[PDB]
PDB file of C-alpha atoms and ligand atoms in Angstrom:
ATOM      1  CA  UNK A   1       0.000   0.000   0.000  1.00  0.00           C
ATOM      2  CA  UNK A   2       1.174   3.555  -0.386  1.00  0.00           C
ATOM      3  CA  UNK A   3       2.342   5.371   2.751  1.00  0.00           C
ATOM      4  CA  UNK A   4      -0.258   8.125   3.753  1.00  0.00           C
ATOM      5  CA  UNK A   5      -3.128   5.824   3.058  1.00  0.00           C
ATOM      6  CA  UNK A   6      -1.912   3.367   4.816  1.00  0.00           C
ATOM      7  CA  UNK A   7      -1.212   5.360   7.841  1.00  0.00           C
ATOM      8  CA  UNK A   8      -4.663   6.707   8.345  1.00  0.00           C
ATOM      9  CA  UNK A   9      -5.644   2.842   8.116  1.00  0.00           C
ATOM     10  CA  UNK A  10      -3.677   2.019  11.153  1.00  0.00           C
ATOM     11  CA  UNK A  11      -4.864   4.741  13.334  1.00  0.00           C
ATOM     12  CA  UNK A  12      -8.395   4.870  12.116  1.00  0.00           C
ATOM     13  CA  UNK A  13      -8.067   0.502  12.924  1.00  0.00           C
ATOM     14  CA  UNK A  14      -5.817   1.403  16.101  1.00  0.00           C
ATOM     15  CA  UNK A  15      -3.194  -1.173  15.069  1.00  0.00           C
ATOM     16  CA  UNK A  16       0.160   0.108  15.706  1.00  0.00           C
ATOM     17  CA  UNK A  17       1.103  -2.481  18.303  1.00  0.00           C
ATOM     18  CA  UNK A  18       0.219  -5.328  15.872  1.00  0.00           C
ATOM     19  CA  UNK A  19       2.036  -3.876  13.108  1.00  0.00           C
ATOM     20  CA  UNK A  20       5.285  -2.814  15.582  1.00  0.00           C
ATOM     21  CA  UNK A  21       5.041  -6.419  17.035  1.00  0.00           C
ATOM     22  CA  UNK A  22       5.157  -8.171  13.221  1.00  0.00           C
ATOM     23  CA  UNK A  23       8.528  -6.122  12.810  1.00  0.00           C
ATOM     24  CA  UNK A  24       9.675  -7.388  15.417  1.00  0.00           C
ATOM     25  CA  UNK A  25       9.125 -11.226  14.606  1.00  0.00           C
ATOM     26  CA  UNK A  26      10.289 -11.075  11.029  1.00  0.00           C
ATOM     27  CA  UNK A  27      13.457  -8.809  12.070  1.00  0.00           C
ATOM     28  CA  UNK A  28      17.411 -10.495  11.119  1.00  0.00           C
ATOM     29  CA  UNK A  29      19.066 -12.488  13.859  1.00  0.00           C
ATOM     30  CA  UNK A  30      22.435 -12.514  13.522  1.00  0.00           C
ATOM     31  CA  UNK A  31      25.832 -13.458  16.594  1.00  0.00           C
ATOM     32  CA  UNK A  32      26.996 -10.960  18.869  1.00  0.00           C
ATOM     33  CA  UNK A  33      29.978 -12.946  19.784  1.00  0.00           C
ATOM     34  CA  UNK A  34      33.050 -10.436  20.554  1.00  0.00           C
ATOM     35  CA  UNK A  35      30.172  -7.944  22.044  1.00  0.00           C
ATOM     36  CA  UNK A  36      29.584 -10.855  24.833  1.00  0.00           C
ATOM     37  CA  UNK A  37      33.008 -11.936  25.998  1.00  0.00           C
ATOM     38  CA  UNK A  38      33.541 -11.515  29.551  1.00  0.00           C
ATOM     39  CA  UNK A  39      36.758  -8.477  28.596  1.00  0.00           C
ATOM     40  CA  UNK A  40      33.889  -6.109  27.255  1.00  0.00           C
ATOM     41  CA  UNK A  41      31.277  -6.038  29.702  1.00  0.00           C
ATOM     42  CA  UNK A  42      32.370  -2.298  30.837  1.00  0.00           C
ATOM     43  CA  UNK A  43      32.268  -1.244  26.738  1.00  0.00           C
ATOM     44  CA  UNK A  44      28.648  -1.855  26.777  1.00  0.00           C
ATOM     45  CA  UNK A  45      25.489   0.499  28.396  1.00  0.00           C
ATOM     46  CA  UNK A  46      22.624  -2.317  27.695  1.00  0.00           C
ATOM     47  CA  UNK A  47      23.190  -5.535  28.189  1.00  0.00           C
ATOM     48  CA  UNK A  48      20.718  -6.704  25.522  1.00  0.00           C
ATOM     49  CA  UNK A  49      22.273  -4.590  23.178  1.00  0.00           C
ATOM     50  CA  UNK A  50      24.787  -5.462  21.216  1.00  0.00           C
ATOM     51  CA  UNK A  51      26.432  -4.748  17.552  1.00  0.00           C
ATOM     52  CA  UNK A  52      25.884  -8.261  15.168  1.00  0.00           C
ATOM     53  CA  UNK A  53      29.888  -9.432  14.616  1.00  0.00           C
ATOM     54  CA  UNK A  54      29.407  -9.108  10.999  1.00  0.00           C
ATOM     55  CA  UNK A  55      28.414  -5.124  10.701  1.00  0.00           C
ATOM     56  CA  UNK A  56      30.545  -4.310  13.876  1.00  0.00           C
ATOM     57  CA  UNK A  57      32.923  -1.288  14.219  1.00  0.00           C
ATOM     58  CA  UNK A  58      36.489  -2.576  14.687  1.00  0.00           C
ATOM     59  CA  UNK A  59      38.921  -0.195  16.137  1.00  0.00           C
ATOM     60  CA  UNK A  60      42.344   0.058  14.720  1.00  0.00           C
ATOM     61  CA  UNK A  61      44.333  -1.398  17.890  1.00  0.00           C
ATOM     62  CA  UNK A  62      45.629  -5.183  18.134  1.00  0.00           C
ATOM     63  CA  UNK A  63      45.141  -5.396  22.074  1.00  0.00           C
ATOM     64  CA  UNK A  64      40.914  -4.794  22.142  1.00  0.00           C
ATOM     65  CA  UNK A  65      39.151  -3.768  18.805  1.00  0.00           C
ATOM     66  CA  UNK A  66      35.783  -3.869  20.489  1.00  0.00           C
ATOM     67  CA  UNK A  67      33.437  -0.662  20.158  1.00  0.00           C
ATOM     68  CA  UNK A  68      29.573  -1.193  20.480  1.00  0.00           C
ATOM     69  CA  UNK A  69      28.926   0.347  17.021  1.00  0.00           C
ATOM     70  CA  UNK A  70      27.350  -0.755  14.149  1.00  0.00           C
ATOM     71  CA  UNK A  71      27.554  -0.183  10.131  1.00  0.00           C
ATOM     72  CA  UNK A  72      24.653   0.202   8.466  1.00  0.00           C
ATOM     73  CA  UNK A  73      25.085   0.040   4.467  1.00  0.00           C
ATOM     74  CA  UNK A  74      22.397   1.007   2.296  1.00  0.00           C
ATOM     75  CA  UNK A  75      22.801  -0.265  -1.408  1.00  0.00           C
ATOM     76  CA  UNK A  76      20.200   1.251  -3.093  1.00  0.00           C
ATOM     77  CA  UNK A  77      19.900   4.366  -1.822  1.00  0.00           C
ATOM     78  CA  UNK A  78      23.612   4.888  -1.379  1.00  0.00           C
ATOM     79  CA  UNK A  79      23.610   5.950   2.091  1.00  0.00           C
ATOM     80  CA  UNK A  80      25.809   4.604   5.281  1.00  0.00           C
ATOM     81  CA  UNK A  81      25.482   5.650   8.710  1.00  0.00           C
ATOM     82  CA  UNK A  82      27.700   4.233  12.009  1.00  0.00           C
ATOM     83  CA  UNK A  83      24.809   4.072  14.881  1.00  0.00           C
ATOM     84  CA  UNK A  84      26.129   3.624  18.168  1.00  0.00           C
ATOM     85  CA  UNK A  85      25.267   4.017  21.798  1.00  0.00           C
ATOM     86  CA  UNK A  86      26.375   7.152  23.831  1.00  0.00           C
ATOM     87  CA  UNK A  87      29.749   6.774  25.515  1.00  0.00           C
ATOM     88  CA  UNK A  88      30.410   5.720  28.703  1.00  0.00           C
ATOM     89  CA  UNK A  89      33.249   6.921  30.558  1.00  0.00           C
ATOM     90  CA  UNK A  90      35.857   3.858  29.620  1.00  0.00           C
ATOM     91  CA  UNK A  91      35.017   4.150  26.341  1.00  0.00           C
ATOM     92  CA  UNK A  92      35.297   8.226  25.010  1.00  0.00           C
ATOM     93  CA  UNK A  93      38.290   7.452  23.721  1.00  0.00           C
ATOM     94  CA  UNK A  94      37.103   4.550  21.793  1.00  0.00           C
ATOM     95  CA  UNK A  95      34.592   6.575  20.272  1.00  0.00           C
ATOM     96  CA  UNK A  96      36.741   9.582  19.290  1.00  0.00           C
ATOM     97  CA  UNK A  97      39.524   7.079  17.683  1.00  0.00           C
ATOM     98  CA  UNK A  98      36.097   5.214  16.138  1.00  0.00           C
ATOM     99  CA  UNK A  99      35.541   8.929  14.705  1.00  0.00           C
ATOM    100  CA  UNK A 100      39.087   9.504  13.415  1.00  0.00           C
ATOM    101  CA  UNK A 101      39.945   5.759  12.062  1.00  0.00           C
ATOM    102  CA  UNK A 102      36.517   5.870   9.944  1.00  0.00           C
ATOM    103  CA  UNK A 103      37.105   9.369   8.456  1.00  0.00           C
ATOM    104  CA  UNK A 104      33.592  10.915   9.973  1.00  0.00           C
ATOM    105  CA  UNK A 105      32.837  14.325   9.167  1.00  0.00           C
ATOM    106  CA  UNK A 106      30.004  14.683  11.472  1.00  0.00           C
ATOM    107  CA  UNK A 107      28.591  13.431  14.917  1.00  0.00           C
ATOM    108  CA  UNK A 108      24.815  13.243  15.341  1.00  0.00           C
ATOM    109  CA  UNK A 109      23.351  13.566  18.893  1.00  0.00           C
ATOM    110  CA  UNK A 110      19.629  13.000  19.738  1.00  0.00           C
ATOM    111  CA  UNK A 111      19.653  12.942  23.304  1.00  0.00           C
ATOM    112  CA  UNK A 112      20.791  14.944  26.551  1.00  0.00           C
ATOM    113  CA  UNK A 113      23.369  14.311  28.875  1.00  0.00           C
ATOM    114  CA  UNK A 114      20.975  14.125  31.582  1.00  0.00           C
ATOM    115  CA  UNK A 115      17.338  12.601  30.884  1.00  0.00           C
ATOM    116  CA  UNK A 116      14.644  11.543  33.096  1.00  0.00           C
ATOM    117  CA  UNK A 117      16.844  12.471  36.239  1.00  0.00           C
ATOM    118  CA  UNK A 118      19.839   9.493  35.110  1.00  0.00           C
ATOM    119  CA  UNK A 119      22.909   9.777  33.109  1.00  0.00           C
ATOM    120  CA  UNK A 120      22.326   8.935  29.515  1.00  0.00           C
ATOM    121  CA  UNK A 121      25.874   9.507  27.916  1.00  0.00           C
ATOM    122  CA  UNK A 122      29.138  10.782  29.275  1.00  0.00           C
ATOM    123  CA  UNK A 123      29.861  14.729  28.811  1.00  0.00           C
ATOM    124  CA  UNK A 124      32.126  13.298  25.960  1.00  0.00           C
ATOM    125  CA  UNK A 125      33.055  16.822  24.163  1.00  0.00           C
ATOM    126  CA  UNK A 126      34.283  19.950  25.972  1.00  0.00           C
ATOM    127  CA  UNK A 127      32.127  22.856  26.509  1.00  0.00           C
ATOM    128  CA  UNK A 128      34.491  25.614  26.866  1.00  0.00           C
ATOM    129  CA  UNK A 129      37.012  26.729  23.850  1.00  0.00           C
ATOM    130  CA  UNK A 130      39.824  27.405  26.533  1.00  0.00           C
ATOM    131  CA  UNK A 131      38.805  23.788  28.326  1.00  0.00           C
ATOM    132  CA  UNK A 132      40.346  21.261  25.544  1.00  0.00           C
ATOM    133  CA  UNK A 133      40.173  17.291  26.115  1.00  0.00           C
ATOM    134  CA  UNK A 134      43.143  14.969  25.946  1.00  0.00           C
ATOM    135  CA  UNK A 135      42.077  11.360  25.657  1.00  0.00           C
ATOM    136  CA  UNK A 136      45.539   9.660  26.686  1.00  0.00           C
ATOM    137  CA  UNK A 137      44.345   5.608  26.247  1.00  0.00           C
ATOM    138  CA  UNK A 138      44.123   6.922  22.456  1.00  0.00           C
ATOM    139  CA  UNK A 139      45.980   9.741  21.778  1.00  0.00           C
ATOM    140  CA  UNK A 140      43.739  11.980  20.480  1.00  0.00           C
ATOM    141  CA  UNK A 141      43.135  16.389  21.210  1.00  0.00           C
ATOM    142  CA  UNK A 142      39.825  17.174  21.225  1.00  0.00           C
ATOM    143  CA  UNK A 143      39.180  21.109  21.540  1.00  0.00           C
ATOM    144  CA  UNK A 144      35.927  23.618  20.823  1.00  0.00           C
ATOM    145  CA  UNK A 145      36.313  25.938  18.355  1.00  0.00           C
ATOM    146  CA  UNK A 146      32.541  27.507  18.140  1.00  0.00           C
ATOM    147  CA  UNK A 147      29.084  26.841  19.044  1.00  0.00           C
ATOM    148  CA  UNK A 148      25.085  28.059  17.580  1.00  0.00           C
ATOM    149  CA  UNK A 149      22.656  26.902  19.794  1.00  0.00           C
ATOM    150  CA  UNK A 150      18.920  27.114  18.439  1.00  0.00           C
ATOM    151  CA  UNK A 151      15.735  26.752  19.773  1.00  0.00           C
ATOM    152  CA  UNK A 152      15.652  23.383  19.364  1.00  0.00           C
ATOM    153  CA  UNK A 153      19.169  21.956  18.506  1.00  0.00           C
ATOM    154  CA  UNK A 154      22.840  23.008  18.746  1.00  0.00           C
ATOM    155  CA  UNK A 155      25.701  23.107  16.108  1.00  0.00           C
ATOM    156  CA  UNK A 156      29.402  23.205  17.406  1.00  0.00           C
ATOM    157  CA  UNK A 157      32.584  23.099  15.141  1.00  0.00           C
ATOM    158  CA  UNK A 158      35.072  20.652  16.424  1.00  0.00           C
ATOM    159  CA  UNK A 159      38.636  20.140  16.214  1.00  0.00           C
ATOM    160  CA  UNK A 160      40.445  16.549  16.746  1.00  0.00           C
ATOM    161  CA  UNK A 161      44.184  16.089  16.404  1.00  0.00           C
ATOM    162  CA  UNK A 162      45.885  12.756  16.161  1.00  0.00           C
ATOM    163  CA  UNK A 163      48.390  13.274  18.496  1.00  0.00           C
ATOM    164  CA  UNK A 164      50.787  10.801  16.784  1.00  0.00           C
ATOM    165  CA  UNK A 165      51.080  12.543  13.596  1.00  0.00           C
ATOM    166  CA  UNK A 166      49.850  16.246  14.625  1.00  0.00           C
ATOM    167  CA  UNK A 167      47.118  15.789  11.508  1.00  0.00           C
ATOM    168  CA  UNK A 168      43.620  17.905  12.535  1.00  0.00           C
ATOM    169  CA  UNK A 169      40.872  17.434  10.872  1.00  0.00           C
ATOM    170  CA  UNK A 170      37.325  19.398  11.769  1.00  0.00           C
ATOM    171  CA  UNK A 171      34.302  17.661  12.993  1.00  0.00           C
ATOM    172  CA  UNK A 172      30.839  18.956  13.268  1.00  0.00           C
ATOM    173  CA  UNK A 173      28.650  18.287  16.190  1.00  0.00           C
ATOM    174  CA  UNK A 174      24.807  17.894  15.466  1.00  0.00           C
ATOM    175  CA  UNK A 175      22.932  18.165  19.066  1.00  0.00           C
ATOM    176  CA  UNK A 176      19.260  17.552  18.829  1.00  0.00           C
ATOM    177  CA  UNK A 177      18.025  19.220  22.416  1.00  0.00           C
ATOM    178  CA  UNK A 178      14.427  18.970  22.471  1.00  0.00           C
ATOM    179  CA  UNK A 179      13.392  15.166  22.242  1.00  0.00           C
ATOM    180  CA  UNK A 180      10.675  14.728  25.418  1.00  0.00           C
ATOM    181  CA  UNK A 181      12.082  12.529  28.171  1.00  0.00           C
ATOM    182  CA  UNK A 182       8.645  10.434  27.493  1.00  0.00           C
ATOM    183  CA  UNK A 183       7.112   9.698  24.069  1.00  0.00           C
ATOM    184  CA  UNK A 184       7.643  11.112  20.686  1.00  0.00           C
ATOM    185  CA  UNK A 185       7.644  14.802  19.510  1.00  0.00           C
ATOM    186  CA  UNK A 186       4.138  15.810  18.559  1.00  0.00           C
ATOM    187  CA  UNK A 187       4.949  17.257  14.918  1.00  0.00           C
ATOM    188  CA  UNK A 188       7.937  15.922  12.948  1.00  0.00           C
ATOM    189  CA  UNK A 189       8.575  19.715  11.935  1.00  0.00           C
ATOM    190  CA  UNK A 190      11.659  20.778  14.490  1.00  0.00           C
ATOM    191  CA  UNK A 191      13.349  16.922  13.544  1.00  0.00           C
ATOM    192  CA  UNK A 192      12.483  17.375   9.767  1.00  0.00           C
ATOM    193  CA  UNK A 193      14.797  20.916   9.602  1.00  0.00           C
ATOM    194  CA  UNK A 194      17.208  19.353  11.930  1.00  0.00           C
ATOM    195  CA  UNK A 195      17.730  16.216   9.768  1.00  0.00           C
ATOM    196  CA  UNK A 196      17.925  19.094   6.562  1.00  0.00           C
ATOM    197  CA  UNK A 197      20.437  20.875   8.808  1.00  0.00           C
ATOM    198  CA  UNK A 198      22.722  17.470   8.847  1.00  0.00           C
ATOM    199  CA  UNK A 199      22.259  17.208   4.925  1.00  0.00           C
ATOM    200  CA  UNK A 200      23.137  20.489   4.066  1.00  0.00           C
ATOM    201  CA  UNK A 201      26.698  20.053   6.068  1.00  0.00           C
ATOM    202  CA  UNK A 202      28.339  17.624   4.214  1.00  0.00           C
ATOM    203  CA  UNK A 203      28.157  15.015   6.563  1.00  0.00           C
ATOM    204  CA  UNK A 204      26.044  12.782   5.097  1.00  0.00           C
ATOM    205  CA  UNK A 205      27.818  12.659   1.618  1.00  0.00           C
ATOM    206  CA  UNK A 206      30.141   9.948   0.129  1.00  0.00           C
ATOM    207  CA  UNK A 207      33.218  11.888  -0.170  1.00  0.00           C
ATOM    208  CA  UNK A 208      33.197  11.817   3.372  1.00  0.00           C
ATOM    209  CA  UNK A 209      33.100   8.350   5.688  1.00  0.00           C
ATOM    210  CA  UNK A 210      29.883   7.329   7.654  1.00  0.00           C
ATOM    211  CA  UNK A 211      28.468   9.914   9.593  1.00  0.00           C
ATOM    212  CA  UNK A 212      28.034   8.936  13.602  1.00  0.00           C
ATOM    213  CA  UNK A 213      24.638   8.612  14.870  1.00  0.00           C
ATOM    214  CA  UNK A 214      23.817   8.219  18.862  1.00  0.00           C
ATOM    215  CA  UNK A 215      21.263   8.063  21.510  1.00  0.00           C
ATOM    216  CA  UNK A 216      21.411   6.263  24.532  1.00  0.00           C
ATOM    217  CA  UNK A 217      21.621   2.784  23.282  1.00  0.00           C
ATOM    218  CA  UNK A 218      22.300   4.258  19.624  1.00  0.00           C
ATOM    219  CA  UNK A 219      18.659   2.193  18.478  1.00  0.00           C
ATOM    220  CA  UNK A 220      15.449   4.015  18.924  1.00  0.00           C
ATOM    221  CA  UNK A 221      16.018   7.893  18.343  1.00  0.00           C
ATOM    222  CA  UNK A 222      19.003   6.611  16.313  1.00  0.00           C
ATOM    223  CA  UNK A 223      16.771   4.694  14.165  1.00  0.00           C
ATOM    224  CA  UNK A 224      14.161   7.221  13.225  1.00  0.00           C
ATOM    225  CA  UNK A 225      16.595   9.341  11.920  1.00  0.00           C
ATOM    226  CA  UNK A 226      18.261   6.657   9.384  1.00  0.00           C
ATOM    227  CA  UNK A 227      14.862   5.474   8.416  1.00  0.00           C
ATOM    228  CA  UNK A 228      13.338   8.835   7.636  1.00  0.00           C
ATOM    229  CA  UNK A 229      16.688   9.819   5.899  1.00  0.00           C
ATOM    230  CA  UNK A 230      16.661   6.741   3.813  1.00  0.00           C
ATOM    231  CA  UNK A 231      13.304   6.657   3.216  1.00  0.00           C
ATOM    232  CA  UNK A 232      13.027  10.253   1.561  1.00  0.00           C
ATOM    233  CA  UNK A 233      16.412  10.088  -0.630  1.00  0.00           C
ATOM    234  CA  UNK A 234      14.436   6.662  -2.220  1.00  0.00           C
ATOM    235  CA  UNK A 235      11.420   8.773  -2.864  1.00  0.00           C
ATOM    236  CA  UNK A 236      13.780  11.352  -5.205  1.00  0.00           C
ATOM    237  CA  UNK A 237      15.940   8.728  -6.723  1.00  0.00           C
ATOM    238  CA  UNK A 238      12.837   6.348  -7.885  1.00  0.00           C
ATOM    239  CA  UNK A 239       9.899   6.374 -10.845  1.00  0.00           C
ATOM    240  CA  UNK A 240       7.091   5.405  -8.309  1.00  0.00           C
ATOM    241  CA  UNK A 241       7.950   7.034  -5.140  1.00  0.00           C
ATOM    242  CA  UNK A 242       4.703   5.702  -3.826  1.00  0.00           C
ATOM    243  CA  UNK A 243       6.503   2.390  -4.042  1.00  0.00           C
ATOM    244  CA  UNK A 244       8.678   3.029  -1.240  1.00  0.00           C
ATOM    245  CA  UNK A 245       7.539   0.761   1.824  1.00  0.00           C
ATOM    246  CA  UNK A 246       8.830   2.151   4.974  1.00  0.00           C
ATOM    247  CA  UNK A 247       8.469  -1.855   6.864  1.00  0.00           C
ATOM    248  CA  UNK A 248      10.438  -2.806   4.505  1.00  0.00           C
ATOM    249  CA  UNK A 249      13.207  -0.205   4.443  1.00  0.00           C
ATOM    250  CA  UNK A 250      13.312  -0.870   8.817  1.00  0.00           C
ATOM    251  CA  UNK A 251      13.552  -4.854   7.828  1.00  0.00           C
ATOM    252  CA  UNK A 252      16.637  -3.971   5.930  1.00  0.00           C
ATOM    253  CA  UNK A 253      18.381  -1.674   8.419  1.00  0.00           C
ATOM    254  CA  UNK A 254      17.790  -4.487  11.074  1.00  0.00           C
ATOM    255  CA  UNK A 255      19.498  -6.538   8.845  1.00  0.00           C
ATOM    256  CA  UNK A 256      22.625  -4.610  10.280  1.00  0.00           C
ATOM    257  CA  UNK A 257      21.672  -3.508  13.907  1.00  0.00           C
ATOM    258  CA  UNK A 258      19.055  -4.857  16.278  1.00  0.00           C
ATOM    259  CA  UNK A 259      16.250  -2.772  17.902  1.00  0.00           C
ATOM    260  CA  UNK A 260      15.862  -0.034  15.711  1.00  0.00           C
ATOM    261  CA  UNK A 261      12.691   1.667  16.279  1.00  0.00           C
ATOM    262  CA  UNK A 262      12.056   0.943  19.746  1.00  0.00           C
ATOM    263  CA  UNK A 263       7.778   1.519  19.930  1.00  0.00           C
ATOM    264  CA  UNK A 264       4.814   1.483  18.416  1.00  0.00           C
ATOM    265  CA  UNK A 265       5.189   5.168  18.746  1.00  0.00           C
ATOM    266  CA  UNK A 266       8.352   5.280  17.178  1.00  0.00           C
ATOM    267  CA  UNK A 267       7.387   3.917  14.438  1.00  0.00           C
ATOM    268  CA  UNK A 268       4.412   6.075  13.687  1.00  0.00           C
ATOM    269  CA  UNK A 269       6.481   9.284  14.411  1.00  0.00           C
ATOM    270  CA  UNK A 270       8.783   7.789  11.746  1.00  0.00           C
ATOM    271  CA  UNK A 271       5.169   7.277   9.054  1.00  0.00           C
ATOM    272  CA  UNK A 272       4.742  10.769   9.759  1.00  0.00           C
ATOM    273  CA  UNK A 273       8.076  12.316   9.310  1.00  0.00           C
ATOM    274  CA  UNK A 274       8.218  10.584   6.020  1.00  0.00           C
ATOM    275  CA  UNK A 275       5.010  11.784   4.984  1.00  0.00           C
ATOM    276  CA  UNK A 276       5.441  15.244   6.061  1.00  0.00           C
ATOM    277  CA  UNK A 277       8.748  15.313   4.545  1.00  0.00           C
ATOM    278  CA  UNK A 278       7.896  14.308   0.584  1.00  0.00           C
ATOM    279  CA  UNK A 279       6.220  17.706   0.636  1.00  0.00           C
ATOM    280  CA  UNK A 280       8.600  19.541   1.605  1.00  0.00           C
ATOM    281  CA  UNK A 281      10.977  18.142  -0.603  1.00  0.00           C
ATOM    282  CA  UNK A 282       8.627  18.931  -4.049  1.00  0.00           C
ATOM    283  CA  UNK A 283       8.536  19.681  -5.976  1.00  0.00           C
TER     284      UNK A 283
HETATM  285  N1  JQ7 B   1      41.776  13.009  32.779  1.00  0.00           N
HETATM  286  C1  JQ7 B   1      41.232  11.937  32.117  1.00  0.00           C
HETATM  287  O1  JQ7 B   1      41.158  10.860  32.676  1.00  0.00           O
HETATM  288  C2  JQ7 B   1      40.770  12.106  30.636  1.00  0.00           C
HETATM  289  N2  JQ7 B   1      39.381  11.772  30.239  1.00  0.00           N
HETATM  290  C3  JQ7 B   1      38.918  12.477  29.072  1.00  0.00           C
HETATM  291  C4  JQ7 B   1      37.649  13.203  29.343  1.00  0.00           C
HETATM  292  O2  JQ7 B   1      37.884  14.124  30.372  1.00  0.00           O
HETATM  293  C5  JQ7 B   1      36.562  12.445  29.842  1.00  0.00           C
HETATM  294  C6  JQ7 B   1      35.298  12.926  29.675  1.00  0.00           C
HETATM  295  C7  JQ7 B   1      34.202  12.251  30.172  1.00  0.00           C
HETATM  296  C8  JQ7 B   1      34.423  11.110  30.874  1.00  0.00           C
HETATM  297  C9  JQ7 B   1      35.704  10.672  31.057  1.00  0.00           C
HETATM  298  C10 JQ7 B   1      36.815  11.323  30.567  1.00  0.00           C
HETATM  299  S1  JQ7 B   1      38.321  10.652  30.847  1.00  0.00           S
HETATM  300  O3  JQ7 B   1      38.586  10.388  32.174  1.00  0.00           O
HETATM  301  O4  JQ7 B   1      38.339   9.566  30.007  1.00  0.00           O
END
């Protein structure tokens, strides 16, 4: 069925849960081996989440390669994205060497440092420009060079220097602020213009490597914003775009990370991001 039709047929039919739940049955199952191993229980925030060993991240460094990270290829639409949960404090270094090794040019944030009253994610970046970071397990300088904040996201310019071989390179930080500690956002419009926002950077392009995507356990906010990104740049590129089936799009992304789209609310927030989005785009 087409998309916008078929939406107002599961709410008028109230079947979102049914629909969510069939995902979940059909979705890939594929070993998390190295994730498991007694050496990396302190690398992970979940315990049932874990990168598949297939489509894991594997850091440049012969004594632990673990990260819990996850490449997610898309063939047809030409896309790739790393999604991966929010650093912990053992593992900030990971990530940033993650960052550097796989030649990102942009980090995408969708959550707070503090949510619900908890810790979600280590204060992994500094927030002064005369405040710089040294990660010393992986040798990298981390320093702020400017920051925008909007009403309802932040953009800061990054620089990270390999301390081994002085190289810099600049990074863009992508800081979504305004996702409600319960639930979904009511209208996709604030996550529409910041997923535009992301596109318009660079940092979703191929001359660039994968950009980073994270949440908390890098699988629910995460995976919204791969979906809808996917989702709309098959809508352009194809004949029919009415042929693009959102299910099926999810069922491939799972292919290469487990979890993604964590509700039934998820995934209609993800229907109507989609929807909204197609006009925006036209024509
Ligand atoms: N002095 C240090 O140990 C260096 N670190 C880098 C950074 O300050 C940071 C940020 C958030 C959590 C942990 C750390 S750290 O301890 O790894």
């Amino acid at each position: 069925m087409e998309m916008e039709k078929e939406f107002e047929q599961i709410d008028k039919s109230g079947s979102w849960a049914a629909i969510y739940q069939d995902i979940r049955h059909e979705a890939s199952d594929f070993p998390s081996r190295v994730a498991k191993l007694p050496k990396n229980k302190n690398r992970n925030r979940y315990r049932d989440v874990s990168p598949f060993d297939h489509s894991r991240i594997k850091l440049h460094q012969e004594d632990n390669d673990y990260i819990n990270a996850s490449l997610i290829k898309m063939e047809e639409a030409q896309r790739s994205y790393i999604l991966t949960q929010g650093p912990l404090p053992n593992t900030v270094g990971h990530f940033w060497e993650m960052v550097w090794e796989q030649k990102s040019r942009g980090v995408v944030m969708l959550n707070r440092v503090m949510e619900k009253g908890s810790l979600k994610c280590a204060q992994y970046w500094p927030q002064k420009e005369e405040k710089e970071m040294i990660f010393e397990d992986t040798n990298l300088k981390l320093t702020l060079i400017s920051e925008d904040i909007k009403s309802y996201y932040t953009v800061r310019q990054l620089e990270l220097e390999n301390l081994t071989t002085q190289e810099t390179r600049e990074i863009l930080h992508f800081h979504y602020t305004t996702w409600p500690d319960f639930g979904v956002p009511e209208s996709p419009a604030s996550f529409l213009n910041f997923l535009f926002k992301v596109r318009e950077s660079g940092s979703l392009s191929p001359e660039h490597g994968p950009v980073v995507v994270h949440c908390s356990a890098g699988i629910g906010r995460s995976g919204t914003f791969c979906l809808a990104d996917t989702c709309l740049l098959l809508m352009d590129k194809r004949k029919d775009p009415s042929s693009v089936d959102i299910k099926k799009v999810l069922l491939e992304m799972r292919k290469f990370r487990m979890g993604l789209i964590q509700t039934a609310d998820q995934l209609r927030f993800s229907y109507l991001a989609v929807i909204e989005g197609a006009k925006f785009i036209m024509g």
